[PDB]
Write a protein that binds this ligand. Structure first.
Ligand SMILES: CCCCCCCCCCCCCCCCCC(=O)OC[C@H](COP(=O)([O-])OCC(O)COP(=O)([O-])OC[C@@H](COC(=O)CCCCCCCCCCCCCCCCC)OC(=O)CCCCCCCCCCCCCCCCC)OC(=O)CCCCCCCCCCCCCCCCC
Ligand SMILES: CCCCCCCC/C=C/CCCCCCCCC(=O)O[C@H](COC(=O)CCCCCCC/C=C/CCCCCCCC)CO[C@@H]1O[C@H](CO)[C@H](O)[C@H](O[C@@H]2O[C@H](CO)[C@@H](O)[C@H](O)[C@H]2O)[C@H]1O
Ligand code: 2GO
Ligand code: 2GO
Ligand code: 2GO
Ligand code: 2GO
Ligand SMILES: COC1=C(OC)C(=O)C(C/C=C(\C)CC/C=C(\C)CC/C=C(\C)CC/C=C(\C)CC/C=C(\C)CC/C=C(\C)CC/C=C(\C)CC/C=C(\C)CC/C=C(\C)CCC=C(C)C)=C(C)C1=O
Ligand SMILES: CCCCCCCCCCCCCCCCCC(=O)OC[C@H](COP(=O)([O-])OCC[N+](C)(C)C)OC(=O)CCCCCCCCCCCCCCCCC
Ligand SMILES: COC(C)(C)C/C=C/C(C)=C/C=C/C(C)=C/C=C/C(C)=C/C=C\C=C(C)\C=C\C=C(/C)CC/C=C(\C)CCC=C(C)C
Ligand SMILES: CCCCCCCCCCCC[N+](C)(C)[O-]
Ligand SMILES: CCCCCCCCCCCC[N+](C)(C)[O-]
Ligand SMILES: CCCCCCCCCCCC[N+](C)(C)[O-]
Ligand SMILES: [Fe+3]
Lengths: 240, 281, 302
């Protein structure tokens, strides 16, 4: 009868849908690899999809996926064991080497652009006429790390123009240069900005930006990477 | 086997218990202390369910069912075949869930992300505990809880509902349902927006958040934003579940008559209660 | 305690953002509305601009025609008395015609005809509005996903108030406009059809609805947990995957063994949601037309 027919059909449909959805979600990170970078033997029952090509605006090119995957960077880790599946220890200082929770990806070394071709993210001082509109204005507050030492002072806010929201705090350090701190890893208080993820001596270590009125995708990854990693790797100096 | 980008993240760290002892993967799955816990609880519970499916006498998934202690048993224990299994399976399931949540925390820690996921999961778990622990306990018996069967838990839903008339008139239920419905609409919209931007008309370039904001302003005079829509999905969905659990914690406890009658508080308000005309006078 | 990014700590405003232009007729956009600081704790503060146009006006109007048509009946039911009106607000109901009249338009205003009128204005208002969602996309050079997804909500709505009443032979089979009276209709519907819990499409509808809440919690939380690496900037993580996308993917792969991409997750999402009302609509269309009783049907697993 019709109802039996409609449901049986639907299950067939749904089966196909899952297939299509699962394959679509295999456009990044596949094929699976062994711990050494070789293609693993068991890829499971789902094949890769025929690739698709995104046209990026502003002449930034195209991305076509699935495509050949590589990290395009040195990875400072080594095996802790003789078989698959254990952790990989950091060969050096994992914060500086960009591994573990301090990891960054080698994204494009240009800044994200808005719909008009302009830099998406600017320090507020060069963003006209942006201003703090509500909540405590952090500019000028001393910055404190998880060791409860002052590591610097807030000197601007980097803001996302098209979305009109705050994205980093620019902070000046003892030596006069600045660093970006992601907005989401700082707690603005009445008389200070607090940063749990980093002890004060680890601020200098924050990756820097090559031009001081813009930040590239690559640089954002290095920074956000570094600051997050601080939760694990500056647990000796926190203190809370 | 690893995703192409996975190795750099597979470092030691972030466990809450057991230090390095269970810090490793099995395939793609992280283990950890709470991965062992989870296994243990889930294994037990499934074993016991497969037992119950013998002490009741079937191996059909559409029939297997594990019922709580009958109401006479109160809050005390009950022989395995008469709802002790259920009792233990309910402990096992709670063990497995809470373990799953704490394991999620461990993964968060190793990945240096926020804890927002397992915090959210916690709201489904509190819903479950309302139905099988907090409601039953406050009502005085395991018997008020729902049973573990596919089609039988549906019957429980129906009986429990109709016990209070048409359950639609539970006000918290109305609010919960508003959230569920809205959530589904928000999920649909979000999904379609992100994709109409990432997959524009043939030959055009990817659109931008600016197009996304723009499209909603054109359409309805407001765009919530890319941060906001994820804020919203999470609030809609958690609130649907919060008001779900609320709607039932109060049913059979602070309110136990017919839900439709509860509305008479509004109608009998003195300033209009006896004005003639309308549906009510 | 850490900062969780549920609300903002600091809002910034710059100049009124009038939007992208592409192929949009700028003549038809309004100018900005106010800025809500309140809203800006959670999302955008900027209200507007909005876009009117002929379809705009048509829908807006037609929807108020629908709305007031119902409100006029409601006042009338309240004997034109403010106090009653508010007291009994949830009880009033603009009911469809009796079954005598079948699909005819003959029924008197007071006993059915007025329901067809409001129904008419609703039909117009919704479908015009659907045309709006397609066109605002087209003007911006964007995909049609929003209009296709909205189509799935329309499906269930058409089924309920139009397609099914036609197939069944009467407008009386349709749903009334009224807060409590539509819930009664809903309960009632289940009873007369043998409990909807036995309609396999009702069960699927539920799975997707719960699925939707489940998924969006996952996703919403995930994007929030990786918002510290820029995660909400989804379109740009699609085109150039960042550690935000990686950390999200891996969280799920470690937790439950598989995972998604920053695009693909939105395909899971659009479908989880559209399938609620898709299955939903079928289940109802089949009820009464082909299945008088879901329990019975169920005993024949078919
Ligand atoms: C029935 C009840 C009535 C219900 C009516 C309401 C229907 C609402 C549907 C909403 C769908 C939203 C999803 C959008 C989407 O991903 O596709 C975009 C796609 C087009 O996007 P676009 O914005 O125009 O283009 C922008 C990009 O260039 C291109 O953008 P893109 O990359 O997003 O497009 C890719 C797209 C390409 O576009 C399409 O062709 C989409 C077609 C699907 C629309 C399904 C309805 C299913 C109903 C159940 C059937 C069973 C009955 C019970 O590929 C797909 O996503 C479809 C794959 C999934 C189907 C799997 C089928 C399994 C079959 C059997 C199983 C096999 C054996 C295994 C066992 O949407 C549609 O074309 C569908 C609209 C329908 C128009 C009708 C015109 C015909 C007359
Ligand atoms: C909703 C619909 C969801 C669609 C799900 C799609 C699943 C996509 C899989 C895609 C392939 C994929 O990339 O993910 C795979 C893992 O999948 C799962 O295990 C997890 C699968 C769990 C799925 C849940 C099924 C249960 C049902 C739930 C209800 C809904 C079902 C609808 C159908 C990756 O899994 C790796 O690749 C292989 C996959 O076939 C292989 O399993 C390998 O094998 C390991 O070798 C090691 C040797 O060193 C060994 O020590 C270890 O123990 C092994 O596991 C894994 O590392
Ligand atoms: C895929 C399934 C999912 C389900 C969960 C779903 C459910 C629902 C429900 C429900 C849970 O019952 C409702 C109530 C619902 C409603 C909607 N869905 Zn809906 N919906 C879904 C999915 C979708 C999708 C993708 C879309 C909608 C879109 C829409 C749209 C359809 C808009 C429409 O039809 O407009 C025409 C009539 C109007 C605007 C006037 C109505 C009268 C009003 C009450 C009067 C007060 C307000 C005036 C406008 C103020 C004017 C003042 C004057 C002085 C100028 C609305 C928000 C529509 C949209 O525009 O989104 C905001 C759209 O694109 N929906 N939707
Ligand atoms: C929430 C209100 C009430 C409670 C008592 C309830 C609880 C539960 C629980 C619980 C608290 O543990 C579970 C696990 C559960 C599961 C179900 N219910 Zn359920 N359920 C309720 C009410 C309903 C209603 C009205 C309906 C379901 C229907 C269903 C259906 C569809 C559920 C769904 O899709 O929810 C969204 C979540 C998704 C998509 C994540 C994936 C979930 C996956 C399908 C779980 C399958 C569970 C196994 C069958 C249980 C075996 C455990 C162990 C032996 C491995 C399944 C069997 C569904 C159905 O068609 O069932 C025959 C349906 O129509 N449920 N249901
Ligand atoms: C809070 C908002 C929302 C609600 C609406 C929601 C609903 C649901 C329902 C529902 C609508 O019924 C179901 C069924 C559901 C299921 C899930 N959600 Zn879910 N879910 C939500 C939100 C979330 C969030 C943030 C998360 C989950 C996560 C998960 C995960 C949790 C998996 C898990 O915890 O595993 C540990 C335990 C295991 C593997 C086995 C336990 C066996 C047990 C001992 C024996 C079985 C006992 C049951 C009570 C049998 C009843 C069956 C009967 C009702 C048919 C599953 C897929 C979980 C996850 O990993 O997802 C893949 C996760 O992180 N969920 N989820
Ligand atoms: C006594 C009631 C009975 C019981 C058995 C029952 C229980 C349950 C439970 C439970 C036991 O807990 C759940 C969880 C449940 C769930 C469902 N049931 Zn259900 N269910 C029942 C009965 C019914 C009935 C009659 C129906 C459903 C239907 C459904 C479906 C409905 C899914 C849904 O999202 O529906 C809402 C969306 C609609 C109707 C689309 C409307 C879109 C339209 C275009 C918008 C128009 C907007 C206006 C112009 C207003 C403008 C506003 C302005 C401010 C802009 C859901 C999954 C729904 C369905 O799809 O059925 C298969 C439906 O028609 N249900 N149901
Ligand atoms: C943008 O970003 C995002 C991503 O990526 C960039 C993502 O991927 C995801 C993830 C979301 C999806 C891929 C969507 C599809 C998901 C669903 C439809 C939800 C359905 C989920 C399931 C069916 C999963 C249930 C399966 C489980 C739990 C696995 C099998 C269970 C076991 C093996 C349990 C036993 C014990 C365990 C695992 C402990 C381990 C210990 C030993 C083995 C010893 C999201 C949300 C996201 O927002
Ligand atoms: C579905 C329901 C859709 C709601 C649509 C609201 C209609 C209000 C239109 C009034 C108007 O034209 O305003 C002009 C006014 C100001 O006047 P003005 O913009 O015409 O000024 C003239 C400027 N020139 C030179 C350029 C043409 O501003 C606005 O646009 C306010 C619109 C904000 C509407 C906010 C509603 C958001 C909530 C909806 C989200 C949920 C979905 C539902
Ligand atoms: C304060 O007072 C004033 C006067 C200012 C305004 C107040 C108004 C009030 C209080 C209005 C209240 C309105 C309410 C409560 C509305 C509730 C509506 C509900 C719950 C609707 C639910 C479902 C509706 C459905 C399913 C409708 C489906 C409709 C269709 C599918 C359209 C079908 C079209 C038909 C039958 C017309 C056929 C004719 C042609 C030409 C196609
Ligand atoms: C306590 C609930 C009983 C669960 C039974 C085992 C679940 C396996 C999945 C059900 C599959 C049903 N199927 C396809 C055989 O009909
Ligand atoms: C899109 C935002 C809409 C938010 C409203 C969600 C539906 C809830 C309706 C009941 C109102 C109860 N509430 C939230 C005020 O407590
Ligand atoms: C987008 C795919 C996600 C999968 C969620 C759906 C799970 C299926 C639930 C079984 C419902 C069974 N029934 C009786 C309604 O037919
Ligand atoms: Fe998203």
């Amino acid at each position: 009868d019709l109802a039996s027919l409609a449901i049986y059909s639907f299950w067939i449909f749904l089966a196909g849908l899952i297939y299509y959805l699962q394959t679509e979600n295999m456009r990044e990170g596949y094929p699976l690899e062994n711990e050494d970078g070789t293609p693993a033997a068991n890829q499971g029952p789902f094949p890769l999809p025929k690739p698709k090509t995104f046209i990026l605006p502003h002449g930034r090119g195209t991305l076509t996926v699935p495509g050949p995957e590589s990290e395009d960077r040195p990875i400072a880790l080594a095996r802790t064991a003789v078989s698959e599946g254990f952790p990989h220890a950091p060969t050096g200082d994992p914060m500086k080497d960009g591994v573990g929770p301090a990891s960054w990806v080698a994204r494009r070394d240009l800044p994200e652009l808005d719909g008009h071709g302009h830099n998406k993210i600017k320090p507020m001082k060069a963003a006209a006429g942006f201003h703090v509109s509500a909540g405590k204005n952090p500019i000028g507050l001393p910055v404190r790390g998880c060791d409860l030492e002052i590591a610097g002072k807030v000197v601007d806010i980097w803001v996302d123009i098209p979305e009109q929201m705050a994205r980093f705090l620019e902070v000046e350090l003892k030596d006069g240069s600045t660093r970006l701190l992601p907005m989401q890893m700082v707690k603005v208080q009445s008389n200070r900005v607090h940063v749990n993820a980093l002890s004060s001596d680890l601020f200098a270590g924050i990756p820097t930006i090559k031009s001081p009125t813009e930040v590239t995708l690559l640089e954002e990854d290095k920074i956000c990477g570094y600051v997050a990693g601080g939760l694990m790797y500056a647990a000796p100096k926190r203190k809370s | 086997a690893l995703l192409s980008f996975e190795r750099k993240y597979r470092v030691p760290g972030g466990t809450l218990v057991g230090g390095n002892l269970f810090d490793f993967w099995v395939g793609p799955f992280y283990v950890g202390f709470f991965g062992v816990a989870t296994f243990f609880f889930a294994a037990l519970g499934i074993i016991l369910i497969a037992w119950s499916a013998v002490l009741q006498g079937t191996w059909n998934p559409q029939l297997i069912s594990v019922y709580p202690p009958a109401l006479e048993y109160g809050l005390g224990g009950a022989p395995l075949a008469k709802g002790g299994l259920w009792q233990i399976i309910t402990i096992c399931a709670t063990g497995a869930f809470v373990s799953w949540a704490l394991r999620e925390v461990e993964i968060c820690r190793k990945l240096g992300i926020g804890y927002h996921i397992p915090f959210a999961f916690a709201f489904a778990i509190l819903a479950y505990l309302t139905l099988v622990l907090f409601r039953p306990v406050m009502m005085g018996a395991w018997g008020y809880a729902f049973p573990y069967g596919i089609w039988t838990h549906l019957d429980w839903v129906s009986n429990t509902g109709y016990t209070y008339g048409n359950f639609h008139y539970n006000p918290a239920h109305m609010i919960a349902i508003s959230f569920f419905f809205t959530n589904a609409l928000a999920l649909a919209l979000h999904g379609a927006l992100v994709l109409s931007a990432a997959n524009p008309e043939k030959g055009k370039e990817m659109r931008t958040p600016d197009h996304e904001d723009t499209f909603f302003r054109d359409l309805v005079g407001y765009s919530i934003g890319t941060l906001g829509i994820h804020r919203l999905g999470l609030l809609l969905s958690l609130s649907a579940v919060f008001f779900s659990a609320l709607c039932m914690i109060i049913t059979g406890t602070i309110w136990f008559d017919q839900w439709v009658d509860w509305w008479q508080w509004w109608v009998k308000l003195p300033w209009w209660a006896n004005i003639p005309g309308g549906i009510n006078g | 305690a850490e900062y969780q990014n549920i609300f903002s700590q600091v809002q910034v405003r710059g100049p009124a953002d009038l939007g992208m232009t592409e192929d949009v007729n700028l003549a038809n956009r309004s100018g900005v509305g106010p800025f809500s600081t309140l809203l800006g704790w959670f999302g955008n503060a900027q209200l507007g601009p909005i876009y009117l146009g002929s379809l705009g006006v048509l829908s807006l109007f037609s929807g108020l025609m629908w709305f007031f048509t119902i409100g006029i009946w409601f006042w009338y039911q309240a004997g034109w008395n403010p106090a009653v009106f508010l007291r009994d607000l949830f009880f009033f109901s603009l009911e469809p015609p009796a079954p005598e009249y079948g699909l005819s338009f003959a029924a008197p205003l007071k006993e059915g005809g007025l329901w067809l009128i409001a129904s008419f204005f609703m039909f117009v208002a919704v479908w015009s509005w659907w045309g709006r969602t397609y066109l605002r996309a087209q003007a911006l050079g964007m995909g049609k996903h929003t209009a296709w997804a909205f189509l799935s909500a329309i499906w269930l709505w058409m089924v309920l108030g139009f397609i099914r009443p036609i197939l069944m032979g009467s407008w009386s089979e349709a749903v009334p406009y009224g807060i409590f009276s539509h819930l009664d209709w809903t309960n009632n519907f289940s009873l007369v059809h043998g409990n909807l819990f036995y309609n396999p499409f009702h069960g699927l509808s539920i799975a997707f609805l719960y699925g939707s809440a489940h998924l969006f919690a996952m996703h919403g939380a995930t994007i929030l947990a990786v918002s510290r690496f820029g995660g909400e900037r989804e379109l740009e993580q699609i085109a150039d995957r960042g550690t935000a996308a990686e950390r999200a993917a891996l969280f799920w792969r470690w937790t439950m063994g598989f995972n998604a991409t920053m695009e693909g997750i939105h395909r899971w999402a659009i479908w989880m949601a559209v399938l609620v009302t898709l299955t939903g609509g079928i289940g109802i269309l089949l009820s009464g037309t082909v299945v008088d009783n879901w329990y019975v049907w169920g005993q024949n697993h078919g």
